Design a binder for this molecule. Structure first.
Ligand SMILES: Nc1nc2c(ncn2[C@@H]2O[C@H](COP(=O)(O)OP(=O)(O)OP(=O)(O)O)[C@@H](O)[C@H]2O)c(=O)[nH]1
Ligand SMILES: CN[C@@H]1CCc2c(ccc(O)c2O)[C@H]1O
Lengths: 231, 53, 284, 333
């Protein structure tokens, strides 16, 4: 008699609280921060500001970011939990093409992440970090790309490619060669579900917060367009 | 070294007593037969006693 | 002769009822299909089912027997329900188009703008507005005509026809057809521009290594509706302004071509793979 | 030195020779004159709603009435099977949780996840009562051995036995190579097993703290493990679409459960009250019911729109519950 009346109030309170929390859950977009070793995730997240979290807001839109450097392990099995994120941010050191090779390991990591069974419909926002050390090494440097990557010798910069102001042609050629190797993996097995968004960012640059916003908006727009069979 | 512990550990697993497979199979069959009438999932209960009905 | 027409009408009724009942059953039975967008579709299916179960069979019986064998009240009710179904089966298309426009052009605010609470209010408002222009001007005698033929036919209980004055004929057309038409045109223009921009972006980004679908989809969606309903609502305005421009038979033919549109909505708005899988299980 | 590594193999072989000599027949040969149980049909009885995201874990209560469940939205909810009305809704500091547990006395609830911290809550006071730290990887399972001590397994190839009152580890178990996925306690709570990520299951001793046996039957990662009610057998489910029933005394497997029409992994394994029916959850969004004595399928439990990630059977053996990524709990009977 009294038991049902007692339980009804608790049920109503819990249901009301869940209905309230549903809106704030749906409003926020979740990202995943995943990078190679010594790439520069820490400086990027610091400029933006076993687990590390960050909540930030732009244009009345709430983003909420996940660093996973805690359980770094050779074998990833916690990758299954992240099949419901909006985007994956990849940070790679562009200037480390001769040390330790490291760029080959980064490319292998990107290829393995791209073809994961559980992450078939997740896009990748890619930040080619450390843009100034690359120019420093290229401009009159002892070590050049063809020594470590043989294919660089014949490659020439695309005609339609637009170089930034006051940039030597060699720097532009090497910079676009680096991006092409990353886009080649994505175009091979995409099939339309997910894409890649290359970028060129250094540590000093502070406009990345707008690039992430624009890329997330484009990702959602493309998903909605494809759902209705118009793209 | 680390191996010595490994050698020691594996040597430990060697010195145990094992029984024939037929005995274990007979014991499992005997237990399953003995408790075969005291579960609802195998033998459905009358709808009166089911609390979810 | 007469029978062949009779044979067709039966096929039309069977198809219209079957498709809509299948769609409603598939949406209702399965939990996966419940979505904010699927309330509008089920409202449209319910309206089309009401039309195909109420207005088509009685109209076919009247045209075959060439004489109304019921009372004046019954055919007045038939006219009211027919107008209600027709004017409620288009604003739903307009609402669906506006929902797609919000979903595509403003992806961040789509969750907040449209919720499960607002959809029911929108559907109720649309149905109330549809029923306000159908039962009120017809059950009350404000729509009736003045000329000799109409008043002579009104008293007789053997023939029930449709004679209206200029005011109702223009007003119902404006409420039912043109206002949804302009909205749908503008919405789909904006949606086409968005797809063109996104294709341009993808091609610029990765053209080196590697607009037809959007054109085909928009073409079918707009063309079916326009071809089915547009010709009738021209002659509807015309036959009042000009006394003897249009005969009776052409008017009736265009009106019955209009009803056919109710049989194509399930084949247009329910081609998603989820709907196909849901149909699989219910069917087999 | 070199001799020592060489020294080990004479040992591995002696083990193989002893196990080969122990076998005299197969379990199928003896279990051949038993009348089959027949086709079994289960029907849904209750369906619980209220989770906003996918579900990873659940654990039936000791009273066979209440149960707890965890989701990826960071919320623990305690249900009531009979009346299907919620009782508690405990928010979580971290939105990533991979396990949950329920005390035998019904006073405490534990949960842990991607953050390497195990949390304990007091139901009958709802505030955090104790936080346990010390692992270097994500947790995978946690079981209350009693009201004062908990045993956990982590992704850093270790397991531990905690003391809630003081908050420090008591004994540490080592010997695995890869990650540790699941564990189960014996009915007398003196021994427990584990399923590693390198296709190997080990039997530990709680009091001594040293490994006793090792089984290397499978070929891929082991995702779930369940302990036979008698206490002398256990079943493991791997990612190669097979289940195996081992035996502690015989120190080798007896039967295998596989079919040619499935190529999906196995996410959960459980037994019945009598130990006759073995239930396993697959990635094909459905569940299968086996026969522990004949390796012949006896039913399918379909109805879930996404993969099954949790499974449990009541202590009274009245009903079986399933959880899926579609954020729905179902009670079958
Ligand atoms: N020249 C240059 N140096 C950078 C840039 N970004 C980071 N660095 C340097 O790279 C060093 C290592 O990167 P951190 O910023 O510490 O990031 P991190 O934590 O090492 O990155 P992970 O090791 O991948 O976690 C830092 O000491 C930075 O000074 C850049 O854009 N240009
Ligand atoms: C009986 N046929 C009717 C006659 C006039 C009319 C129709 C539909 C919608 C309207 O707004 C109308 O004014 C037709 O279906």
């Amino acid at each position: 008699r009294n038991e049902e009346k007692a339980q009804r109030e608790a049920n109503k309170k819990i249901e009301k609280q869940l209905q309230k929390d549903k809106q704030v859950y749906r409003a926020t977009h979740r990202l995943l921060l995943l990078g190679a070793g010594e790439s520069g995730k820490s400086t990027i997240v610091k400029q933006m500001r076993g687990i590390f979290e960050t909540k930030f807001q732009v244009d009345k839109v709430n983003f909420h970011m996940f660093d996973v450097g805690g359980q770094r392990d050779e074998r990833r099995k916690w990758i299954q939990c992240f099949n419901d994120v909006t985007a994956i941010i990849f940070v790679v050191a562009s200037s480390s093409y001769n040390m330790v090779n490291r760029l080959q390991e980064a490319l292998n990591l990107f290829k393995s992440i791209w073809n994961n069974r559980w992450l078939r419909t997740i896009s990748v926002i890619l930040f080619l970090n450390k843009q100034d050390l690359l120019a420093e090494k290229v401009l009159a440097g002892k070590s050049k790309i063809e020594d470590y990557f043989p294919e660089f010798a014949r490659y020439t910069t695309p005609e339609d490619a637009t170089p930034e102001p006051g940039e030597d042609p060699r720097v532009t050629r090497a910079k676009y060669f680096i991006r092409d190797e990353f886009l080649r993996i994505s175009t091979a097995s995409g099939d339309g579900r997910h894409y890649c968004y290359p970028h060129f960012t250094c540590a000093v640059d502070t406009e990345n917060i707008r690039r992430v916003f624009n890329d997330c908006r484009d990702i959602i727009q493309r998903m909605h367009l494809r759902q209705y069979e118009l793209l | 070294a680390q191996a010595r512990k490994l050698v020691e550990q594996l040597k430990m697993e060697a010195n145990i007593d094992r029984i024939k497979v037929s005995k274990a199979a007979a014991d499992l069959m005997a237990y399953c037969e003995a408790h075969a009438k005291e579960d609802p999932l195998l033998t459905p209960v009358p709808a009166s006693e089911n609390p979810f009905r | 002769w007469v029978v062949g027409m009779g044979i067709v009408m039966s096929l039309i009724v069977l198809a219209i009822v079957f498709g809509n009942v299948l769609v409603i059953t598939a949406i209702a039975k399965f939990e996966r299909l419940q979505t904010v967008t699927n309330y509008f579709i089920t409202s449209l299916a319910c309206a089309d089912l009401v039309m195909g179960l109420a207005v088509v069979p009685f109209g076919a019986a009247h045209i075959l027997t060439k004489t109304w064998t019921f009372g004046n009240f019954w055919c007045e009710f038939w006219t009211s329900i027919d107008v209600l179904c027709v004017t409620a089966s288009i604003e739903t298309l307009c609402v669906i188009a506006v929902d797609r426009y919000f979903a595509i052009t403003s992806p961040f605010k789509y969750q907040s703008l449209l919720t499960k609470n607002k959809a029911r209010v929108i559907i109720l408002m649309v149905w109330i507005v549809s029923g306000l222009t159908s039962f009120l001007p017809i059950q009350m005698h404000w729509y009736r005509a003045t000329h000799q033929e109409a008043i002579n036919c009104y008293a007789e209980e053997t023939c029930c026809d449709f004679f209206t004055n200029q005011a109702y004929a223009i007003a119902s057309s404006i409420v039912s057809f043109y206002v949804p038409l302009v909205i749908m045109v503008f919405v789909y223009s904006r949606v086409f521009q968005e797809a063109k921009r996104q294709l341009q972006k993808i091609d610029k980004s990765e053209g080196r290594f590697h607009e037809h679908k959007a054109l085909k989809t928009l073409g079918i969606i707009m063309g079916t509706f326009t071809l089915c309903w547009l010709p009738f609502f021209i002659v509807n305005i015309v036959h009042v302004i000009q006394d003897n421009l249009i005969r009776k038979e052409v008017y009736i033919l265009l009106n019955w071509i209009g009803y056919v549109n109710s049989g194509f909505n399930p084949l247009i708005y329910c081609r998603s793979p989820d709907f196909r899988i849901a149909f699989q299980e219910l069917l087999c | 030195l070199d001799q020592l590594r060489q020294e080990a193999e004479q040992l591995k072989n002696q083990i193989r020779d002893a196990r080969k000599a122990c076998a005299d027949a197969t379990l199928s040969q003896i279990t051949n004159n038993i009348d089959p149980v027949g086709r079994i049909q289960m029907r849904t009885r209750r369906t619980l709603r209220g989770h906003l995201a996918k579900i990873y874990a659940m654990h039936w209560g000791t009273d066979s009435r209440l149960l707890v469940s965890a989701s990826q939205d960071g919320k623990l909810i305690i249900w009531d099977s009979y009346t299907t009305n919620k009782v508690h809704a405990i928010p979580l500091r971290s939105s990533w949780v991979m396990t949950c547990a329920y005390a035998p006395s019904g006073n405490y609830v534990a949960c842990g996840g991607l953050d390497n911290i195990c949390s304990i809550y007091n139901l009958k006071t709802v505030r955090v009562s104790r936080e346990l730290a010390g692992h270097t990887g994500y947790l995978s399972c946690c079981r209350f051995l009693d009201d004062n001590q908990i045993v956990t397994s982590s992704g850093d190839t270790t397991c531990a036995l905690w003391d809630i009152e003081t908050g420090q580890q008591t004994t540490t178990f080592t010997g695995h190579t890869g990650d540790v996925m699941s564990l189960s306690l014996a009915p007398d709570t003196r021994l427990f097993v584990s399923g590693a990520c390198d296709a190997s299951a080990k039997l530990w001793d709680v009091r001594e703290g040293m490994c006793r046996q090792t089984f290397t039957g499978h070929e891929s990662d082991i995702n779930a493990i369940c302990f036979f009610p008698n206490g002398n057998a256990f079943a493991t489910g791997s990612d190669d679409a097979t289940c195996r029933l081992f035996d502690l005394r015989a120190d080798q497997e007896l039967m295998t459960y596989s079919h040619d029409n499935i190529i999906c992994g196995i996410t959960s394994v459980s037994f019945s009250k009598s130990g006759r029916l073995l239930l396993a959850g697959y990635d094909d969004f459905n569940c299968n019911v086996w026969d522990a004595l004949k390796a012949d399928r006896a039913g399918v439990l379909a109805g879930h729109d996404n993969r099954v990630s949790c499974l449990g059977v009541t202590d009274d053996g009245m009903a079986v519950a399933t959880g899926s990524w579609d954020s729905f709990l179902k009670i079958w009977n």
